[PDB]
Design a protein around this ligand. Structure first.
Ligand code: 9AX
Ligand code: 9AX
Lengths: 289, 289
C-alpha cells in the first residue's frame, strides 16, 4: 500500500488506483476548466461540455471524492453581451442537459454551486432561471453520496460573503459560527481543505476560498485543461500521494559529510534556477526550464 | 518603459529597476522564509536574521512597496519545548534587535503582524512579551510610509477571525464591514491583493489570507529562500511585469493556418508535460523537468 512503485501505479487497473486514492487521498481536488477557447481553436458549448464530463468522470473514477471546479469568474464582464448569454447557456447546461444529469445519477454526484453568482448574475429572466436551476440541482442530487462536485461561479472573493453570513448566523444563533459552519455556509456543505490544484499555463491558483493551505499540492500542465490524459493524472496523483510528504523526513545531523555536499551541489550547481518564469509565443505564455 | 528588454533589465542599475517597479509593480509581494534549517546546515537566530534582512532589503530596494512574509505557522507545535522558546526569541528579534530596527528606520518600514498569534501564542510571560512587542512595533513604525512589512504568525486560516471581526463591527457600526475594512482588520491596515508569491521547493502557497487572486504570479525557486540572488529576483520581476500579462492578447482567428499548427505542436509535442511533479533525494523533494 505505502510501497507501490510509480511504474506499477501507472500499470495498475483503474479500480486499483481508485482504491489507493480512497485510502491515501487526495480527498479534495481543485480542477478549473481553463484554455477552453484555445482548445476549441485547435481540436463549442456541446464540445466543452463533453470534455468537462470526460475529465470530471476521470477524476471521480480515480477515487477523488470531491472536485472543486471554478468555471466562471468576475472576469466575465470583460467581454460583450453575446458572452453573457452564451455563458448563462453554459451554466444552464450544467443543471439541465440530459447527458450530464445522467452523469450525476450514474456516478452518484452531489452538485453544489459557490460564489457571488446570486448577486453578480445579470438581474434578468435568464439569470434568475440559472439561479433557480442551481438551487434545484443542489437539492436534486442531495441523495447522492459517492461524489461531491462544486462549481465556482464568481467564487473568487469570499470575504464580504463570510462577513454577512457570520453576522446573520450570530444574530439568529447568539454565537459566531465555527470555521466548519462558515465553510458549510459558503459551499453549501462542509468540504475539507483542497489536497491539490491542477492548473495550466501561467503558475497561478484561484477560486477556491477558505479551502487552501500549504498542503494544497500545486500542479501546472503545459497544455489546456481538456488535454488532460490518463498518464498525466496518475503522475500527478502519484507525486502528491507518495512524494510531496515523504517519510521518514530528512535527518541532516545523521548524514555523512559527502551526502551533505551532494545535496548542497544540487542547489548551488544551478544557483539561479527558478520555476515560474516563462517566455511568450504568439501572446501565449509558456513556462521555461 | 513598456519596451525594456530582459537583458537591459538585468543590466540596469538598482535605482532604475526600482523606478520601473514603482510604476509597473508588483506593489505587493509575498515572500515566506522557508528552508532555514536546511540553509543553516549547508552554509542560527543571528544568521537567519541577517539573511532575512538581506532579502527584505533587496525586495524593498527594488521598488516593492509591501512585502507579506509568513514566518510562523500552526505547524510550530509539531516540535519540542526548546522550539517554542527559540521561536519566541526569533519573534522578539523582529521587534527588539537594533540592526533590524535600524533597517526599519533606514528604509522607513511600517511593520505589521497578522495571524492568530494572540490566541495561539503560549499563554505565558514570554508569549505576552512578544505580543506587546508586536503591538508596540506596529505603532512605532506608523510614521514610516516608504514600505510596509507584514509578518505572518499563525496567519493561515482567517475564516474564524473574519467572522468574529465582522460580528463586532456590525454590532458597533450597525452595518457589515466592506471587504476593505475586513482586510484592514486582519492585517491592521489595507493591503492590495498579492501580485506575486515567491516560494521554494514543493509547489505550494500559504499564509496570506484574503490577498490571493488568479493574478498572483507564482514562482518556486529550487534552492532555499535565503539563497535568493539578485539575478533570480530580476528574472522573476521581469517575468511578472512583462510576460505574465502580455498585450495585445492573442487573436486566434486572425492567425495563419501554420501559426496555429506550430502552436498546437507546442502542446502535443510533449502531451503529458507537467510542472509540479518531482523526485525525492534524501527525503528532499525536487521539481522535475
Ligand atoms: C470562462 C469561459 C471562457 C474563458 O476562456 P479561457 O479560460 O480564458 O481560455 P482562453 O484563454 O484559451 O480563451 C466560458 C466557460 C464555458 C466555455 C464553460 C467551460 C466549462 C463548463 C461548460 C458549461 C461546458 C462551459 C460551456 C460554455 C462556456 C462558454
Ligand atoms: C518556522 C521555523 C523553522 C521551520 O523550518 P523550515 O521552513 O521547515 O525549513 P526546513 O524544512 O529546511 O527545516 C523557525 C523560524 C526562524 C528560523 C525565523 C526565520 C525567519 C525570521 C527569523 C526571526 C530570523 C527567524 C529566527 C529564528 C526562527 C527559529
Amino acid at each position: 500500500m505505502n510501497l507501490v512503485s510509480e511504474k506499477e501505479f501507472l500499470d495498475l487497473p483503474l479500480v486499483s488506483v481508485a482504491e489507493i486514492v480512497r485510502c491515501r487521498g487526495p480527498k479534495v481536488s481543485v480542477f478549473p476548466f481553463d484554455g477552453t477557447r484555445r482548445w476549441f481553436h485547435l481540436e463549442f458549448q456541446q464540445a466543452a461540455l463533453r470534455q468537462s464530463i470526460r475529465i470530471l468522470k476521470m477524476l471521480f473514477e480515480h477515487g477523488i471524492e470531491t472536485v472543486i471546479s471554478p468555471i466562471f469568474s468576475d472576469d466575465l464582464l470583460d467581454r460583450g453581451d453575446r458572452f453573457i448569454v452564451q455563458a448563462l447557456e453554459g451554466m444552464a447546461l450544467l443543471a439541465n442537459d440530459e447527458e450530464i444529469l445522467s452523469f450525476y445519477k450514474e456516478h452518484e454526484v452531489h452538485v453544489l454551486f459557490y460564489g457571488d453568482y446570486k448577486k453578480r448574475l445579470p438581474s434578468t429572466a435568464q439569470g434568475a432561471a440559472v439561479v433557480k436551476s442551481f438551487d434545484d440541482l443542489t437539492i436534486s442530487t442531495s441523495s447522492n453520496t459517492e461524489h461531491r462536485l462544486c462549481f465556482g461561479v464568481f467564487g473568487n472573493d469570499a470575504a464580504e460573503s463570510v462577513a454577512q453570513f457570520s453576522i446573520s448566523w450570530n444574530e439568529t444563533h447568539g454565537k459566531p459560527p465555527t470555521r466548519r459552519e462558515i465553510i458549510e455556509g459558503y459551499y453549501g456543505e462542509y468540504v475539507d481543505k483542497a489536497d491539490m490544484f491542477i492548473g495550466f499555463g501561467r503558475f497561478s491558483t484561484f477560486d477556491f476560498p477558505l479551502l487552501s493551505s500549504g498542503k494544497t499540492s500545486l500542479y501546472f500542465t503545459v497544455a489546456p485543461s481538456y488535454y488532460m490524459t490518463e498518464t498525466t493524472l496518475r503522475r500527478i496523483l502519484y507525486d502528491h500521494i507518495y512524494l510531496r510528504h515523504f517519510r521518514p523526513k530528512p535527518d541532516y545531523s545523521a548524514m555523512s559529510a559527502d551526502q551533505l555536499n551532494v545535496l548542497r551541489n544540487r542547489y548551488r550547481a544551478q544557483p539561479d534556477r527558478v520555476f515560474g518564469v516563462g517566455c511568450v509565443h504568439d501572446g501565449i505564455w509558456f513556462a521555461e526550464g
